[PDB]
Write a protein that binds this ligand. Sequence first.
Ligand code: PLP
Ligand code: PLP
Lengths: 810, 810
Amino acid sequence: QISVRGLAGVENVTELKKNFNRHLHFTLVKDRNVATPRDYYFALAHTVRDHLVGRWIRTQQHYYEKDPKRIYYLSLEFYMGRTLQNTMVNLALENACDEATYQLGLDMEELEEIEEDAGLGNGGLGRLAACFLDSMATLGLAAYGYGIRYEFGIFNQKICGGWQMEEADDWLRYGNPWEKARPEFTLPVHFYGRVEHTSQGAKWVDTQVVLAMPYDTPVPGYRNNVVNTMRLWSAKAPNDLGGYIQAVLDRNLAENISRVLYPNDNFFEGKELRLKQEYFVVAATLQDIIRRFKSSTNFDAFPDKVAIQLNDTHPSLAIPELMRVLVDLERLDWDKAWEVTVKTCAYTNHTVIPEALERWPVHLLETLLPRHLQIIYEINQRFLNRVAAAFPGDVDRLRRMSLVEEGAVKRINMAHLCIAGSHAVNGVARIHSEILKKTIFKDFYELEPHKFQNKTNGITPRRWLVLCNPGLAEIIAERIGEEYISDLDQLRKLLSYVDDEAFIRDVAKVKQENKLKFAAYLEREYKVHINPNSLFDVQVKRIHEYKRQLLNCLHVITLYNRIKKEPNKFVVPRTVMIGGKAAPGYHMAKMIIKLITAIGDVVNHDPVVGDRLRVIFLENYRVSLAEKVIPAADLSEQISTAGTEASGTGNMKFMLNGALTIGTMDGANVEMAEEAGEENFFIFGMRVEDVDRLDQRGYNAQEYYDRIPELRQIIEQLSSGFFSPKQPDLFKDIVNMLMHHDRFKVFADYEEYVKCQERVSALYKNPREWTRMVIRNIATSGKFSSDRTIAQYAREIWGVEPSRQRLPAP
Amino acid sequence: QISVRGLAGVENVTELKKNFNRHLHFTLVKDRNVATPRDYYFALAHTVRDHLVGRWIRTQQHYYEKDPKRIYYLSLEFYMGRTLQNTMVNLALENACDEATYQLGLDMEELEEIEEDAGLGNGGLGRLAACFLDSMATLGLAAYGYGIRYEFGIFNQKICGGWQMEEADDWLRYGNPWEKARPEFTLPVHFYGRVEHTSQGAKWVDTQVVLAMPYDTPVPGYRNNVVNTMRLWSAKAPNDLGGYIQAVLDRNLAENISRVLYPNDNFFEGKELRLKQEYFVVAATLQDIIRRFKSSTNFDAFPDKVAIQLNDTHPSLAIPELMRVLVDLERLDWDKAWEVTVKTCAYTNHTVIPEALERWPVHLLETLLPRHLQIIYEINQRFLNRVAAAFPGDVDRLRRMSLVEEGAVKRINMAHLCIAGSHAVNGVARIHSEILKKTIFKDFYELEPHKFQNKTNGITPRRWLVLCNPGLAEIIAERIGEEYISDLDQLRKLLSYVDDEAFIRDVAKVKQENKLKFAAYLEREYKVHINPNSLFDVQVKRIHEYKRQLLNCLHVITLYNRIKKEPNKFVVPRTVMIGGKAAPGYHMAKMIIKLITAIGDVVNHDPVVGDRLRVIFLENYRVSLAEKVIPAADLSEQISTAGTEASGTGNMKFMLNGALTIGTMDGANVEMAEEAGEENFFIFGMRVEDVDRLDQRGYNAQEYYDRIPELRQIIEQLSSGFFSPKQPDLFKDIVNMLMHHDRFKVFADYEEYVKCQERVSALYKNPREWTRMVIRNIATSGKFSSDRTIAQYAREIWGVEPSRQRLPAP
Ligand SMILES: *Cc1c(COP(=O)(O)O)cnc(C)c1O
Ligand SMILES: *Cc1c(COP(=O)(O)O)cnc(C)c1O
């Protein structure tokens, strides 16, 4: 059908149909008479999977022969989403499979909807790991993603009575055709025990053993025949067990380690199970790395053949674990082992929010990992000696930089451990990286300035453009070719089409088709009533106070009140869509979701409003839903308080898909506006400097409430029960927070936000100019490709050169 | 190589090799350079499995079209063993696969040893279910085996310091290529709750729900293209869940139902988890049966289209569950529902031992299955009204026949429930069935004589002859053809070769080769030292006091003492092998194992003994080990106290494989001696009548101890610490039991047993005559084919005719 989807050759299609029927018969053990849509999905998946194996085997054989430096990306989250379409795209099999299934009398799009999302992540941090894997494969790097195979990913969200309800994400129920269990490579992981000091070195004895079983999933590069690996560990109890029956049943105690993903987004919860998960992934991965290193004993070359990237501090135990192995097992002297460790590890920070920082209680590490605690203490001591030497007499700096935090209970600052044991520390957006050097990590930057870098986040244009928005990818390819898909900077060539009447019309047509498509999906599933002609105003991301879904709510209520005030006055029609999950134990986030649905209950049923304003809460927001709503959006809401969103990535997805952005100068928003030009962005609100000034003076919400009549009305409506008749004080906690303890200054940006939104509605009334501004955004989104991000990590941190060379065919 | 293994055609072999390499590549994702023997085993398994799917699909389609009466065999145990070789045998693919792998440079026998036994059973009862499935498929019956997919089967037995150690049987670790998960057919099972009585009927509400997920395994008939199904249920928690994390982790509470097989053989343990397993299998299976019935609403025809066979009382809840469904859900009147239930169910009893009888406490059923308890009470009441009417005034008979047992705690006699709700009740050997009518079920037989039948057990000649003893199957086929493999009575034709010098020599040659083969295996694995020229005296079966492994021990010690008394006197060399597992909580059985190894520690290292006597304990006895040792045996020990072994099946395996039998007139031994002629059997000991006389008088072990010098010496050796130097009183419990509370009268059969063993050694000294007697046994073993057993069940209980017709090809 469309060019960018590859060729559907006679031989190829015939071969596909043949193999589809083979799998349906032999693999699924079914015949055409009893097969269900799910059976058909699996037959297709196995058929596509087959095309991947040959390349997978020779890619790995290739690395074994050329022995390049390996990149190990350690993360406790890999937010993969679905794998079928992405695999077809990267193998240029999409049109062929579409035709093959068409001839078999099946609708491929219907089959793709059956696949379960691999939701092994919470949000930004986990999805970045996913985009990164795609870019590393596309850039020909010998990379391996290492994580945990949770049998339950991020919970599925159900909305009942306007409230969030959580249900287990049993994504493996029907099986996972993409993974390959590798029981032969199982490794032991140790916990508890005690440390024994013998003549020649310390020994960690009397430990509890849990086995780590690896499951490998292929990661295909874009049309370059490279297929890398994502290895996920699963917990298994050893076989060596009222006495008998119970002993067997207790095996699940050990296997609970990989049972479920902790649903906290940017929030630290010091639970023992979480700590076990963190060590489990680190211990198994490091043995795997070392094993592979010794195959093709000086460890001096270790840093030249190995690079370990820590995604946040979750896998920070890799630092002391690597030291433990080198010093305790390999018997290297401390100083030598430390040099190797520092040169091997690099750390990526994802937030400056205090409640998100990992600070593990000493008594927990003491019981669970006694040897690691001793190593951490030794690291801290030698580090502080270095600080004392560089800043003589500065005793306060000593306590500020210590990895050990005194107080009620002693804690280990994992962020400090990561900086001390890494040769590179990076922020994820220019403003974020600057904030790290100027504030929270100022002391460390002063001691070792060379370690601090910036690596602005990015997204993969394969999943976030070609896969989810084929219509847009096609009209773009029509003018500039297909080269941009793996070289996004080429989109700048689109700048010469900003006055092209044909292009303007096509860009607008693609958006309209996406909106109609999504509007239908909302009806087909969930039975809603949105109007395709309205402006699609969307804010999708995890529910968090710093994200400010509440500021958006205030605007919605403002719009509704203005309409009720002057009913027959014209207003640009809008469909406000808000979606995202709230962590199960985050009360305020759960109240915000209820507020949104409550507002919808009033606004969507008011006769005077009509179809001029609709408020919809997008249920169960996840990767596959993002692929649907983002291409249909007109306005992207990125309104976090300045200085709180380290980077953001959703913002980049919206920009690449033709939506204009309304946001604060926070995270990557600053760089996006810089690339597209501020006049092509809807910027508003306090800048980081403004927030600091307010904090110096002291934030008093009452002041805003007293001086802004429209705001006062909203707060009084919430308080009086206008949005909760049967429960008048239902939102008392929300009002109290906004009025007395709002860490994110919602009221402070209210006025500028509302005015900015007016400028948005004004531009939307002029279709031609709205579309021209859209073209200016899409054309300058190239910098946000994760291929650019990965190329920088490769050259500036890992010391390897990316390659676009096709691997010697399949 | 050998005839009975089929043809290895040019096209077939080429096709096999091609598909072997396909699976190694695409299925296992490996190449010739990194593949291990296990990888090769799986490639072969998947290749053979492929040949099974086509027949499997059309067999089931066939039943759907012809709609014959279905046979449902309900059992909590299916002792399957390995599946690879058995599948090749039944598909006539053995020689082809042997050649194909040979050309690929692989040894198929080495690959077969890699497969994990499917040990979902304890012993006799579970293996019978397995043989039965094979025979039902071979006889073309539309049969389905229904059970539980335990993730842990019978524990693997390790011997440490002479003691049994148990370790988890993680048989699914590397995956099971034979099963096919059918998540689409998942069914809900209810537990707990309470009963509500409404206007129109009772309702079971507020229940806890556990899902039953089925896994189907194919069961191929012998060269008839029939492939039946064994459906095993797996427990899964529903998705509808500190609050969050814990809720997810607690899912394993529900999934523990199918976690592990209870390791008790012929012993009842009233644990709640076991009760849940029993209802789980019954509830899921009955919904599946009814669903299938309604597809191709009078339930009057239900008995004409459905037959449910209960293997022991474990699945006895099927009776009240069927009533519950018909009365509560389908709304049939009681009397109508009961008529249907009785005509549908049939019960098979496996033992008369009191401690093995299931008597569930009322308070347990009351809490777990409140509605079923009410139904059982109603059944009991109407049954007793029938008894009161037939035997007016006989109040003691009323309490004796009641399904409800009064006493310390009220219990439900599940055996009584089975008789009341079944149209047929059968014993498993003539003597056993007679004992049921004369003793434990005498009252029931008097009330309904027509219900009681006999169905002597049998074994499948495919696994127990062709598969494990190809050498013997071949020399037999050389004279009488291959027809006997599915018509074992033809072995009688071998009677005309009893004087054939060529045959006598071949039979003896095959046995010698099997012994050398096994002797090697004992060395290769476990490093032992047996002598192939000695008489292989073996007793393999579960360790139990009624089996009398102790009587055997006494003989061994007697032999050892006689040698020490007259060292230079000639004695026929023997290798005594004893094997079997002991239930984890059965103390005496565990002490018996230690005694055996202890005896070996003394006997095997005494210089004076030399290689004239060896005592070896066969570790981890299981189906695959049985296939190895049985063909190598010269003497089969079947020495249970008369009246305690209902039938036995191991005895039949030894008879079919050329071993002579030394045993009591118990179980099927009586029928075996009857078929072969008593002069061709080594019968000894008390008969059932003799045991009763002794009980009338009162058994006093002391009498035997006082009158038999050799026996007194043995007991004094055990007591003094002769077999346990460091621990003199180690076997005090054994001696005390033998002397004061031996329920099985070991001493009473000692003298006759020893004398009989002398007659055995005498015959062994005459190779020619020993072999001629062996031929007389093999030739008359035909009656013990499970094909005969199944044909009788079909005609006399299920009302269906067996068929030997080939199904319309694959
Ligand atoms: C891209 C993405 C995110 C991150 O969005 P932000 O707005 O940067 O927080 C979160 N969830 C999903 C499903 C995503 O695809
Ligand atoms: C045949 C068999 C049994 C039953 O043997 P008996 O001597 O009748 O108790 C037990 N275990 C296994 C592994 C068997 O193959």
